[PDB]
Design a protein around this ligand. Structure first.
Ligand SMILES: CC(C)CN(C[C@@H](O)[C@H](Cc1ccccc1)NC(=O)O[C@H]1[C@H]2CO[C@H]3OC[C@@H]1[C@H]3C2)S(=O)(=O)c1ccc2nc(NC3CC3)sc2c1
Lengths: 99, 99
């Protein structure tokens, strides 16, 4: 759909067989969830934001459904304050900015 | 214009008489710049992100030009890794998400 920005642009997602809410985040290169349980092998990764860096687990080739749209890609798991859908997934569902 | 997300959605802004580049950031409630010199009174503020909290100066009712569009609002100044235009300004210029 079209989403205005008067409120946080939060959408419902399905990942790893679990349901979560996440922020559509154009300022995020990558996609980050707190407290999901994904299968398989992962790589430790350090990522930087406001306030410094945080350690995450990097999982590759993870299917995700984002407001009804299917995608597959890297998902980072770590102690983010809010789950974020970043550009690596937003490009797959055709998300654009308009003004 | 329309902006796709294959690259970071960086735009040119004018604020405090200075020219900067900034990321259009739908995941940001507020607007944050590193190293700009704004006039007048400010109040200290702590804000949270990935990796923890950071101290910023909060300046209110600051005029800003964002890719040619005029707005006025709160601008935070502090050691962010990249300048971000958040929803407090994006709503003023009519920015929306589309997919
Ligand atoms: C900082 C920004 C440049 C990047 N971020 C995305 C932002 O959209 C972030 C989302 C968020 C919201 C809430 C809490 C935590 C985070 N927003 C934020 O921190 O906003 C803050 C402050 C601003 O106003 C209020 O609104 C929310 C609060 C609050 C005060 S990220 O998460 O660090 C981030 C995300 C993905 C990512 N991928 C990388 N890959 C590597 C490169 C190859 S690096 C990387 C960094």
């Amino acid at each position: 759909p079209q989403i205005t920005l008067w409120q946080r642009p939060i959408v419902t997602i399905k990942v790893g067989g679990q349901l979560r809410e996440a922020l559509i985040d154009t300022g995020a290169d990558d996609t980050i969830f707190e407290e999901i349980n994904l299968p398989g092998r992962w790589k430790p990764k350090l990522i930087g934001g406001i306030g410094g860096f945080m350690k995450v687990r990097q999982y590759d080739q993870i299917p995700i459904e984002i407001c009804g749209h299917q995608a597959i890609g890297t998902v980072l798991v770590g102690p983010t304050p809010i789950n974020v859908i970043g550009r690596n997934m937003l490009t797959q569902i055709g998300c654009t900015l308009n003004f």
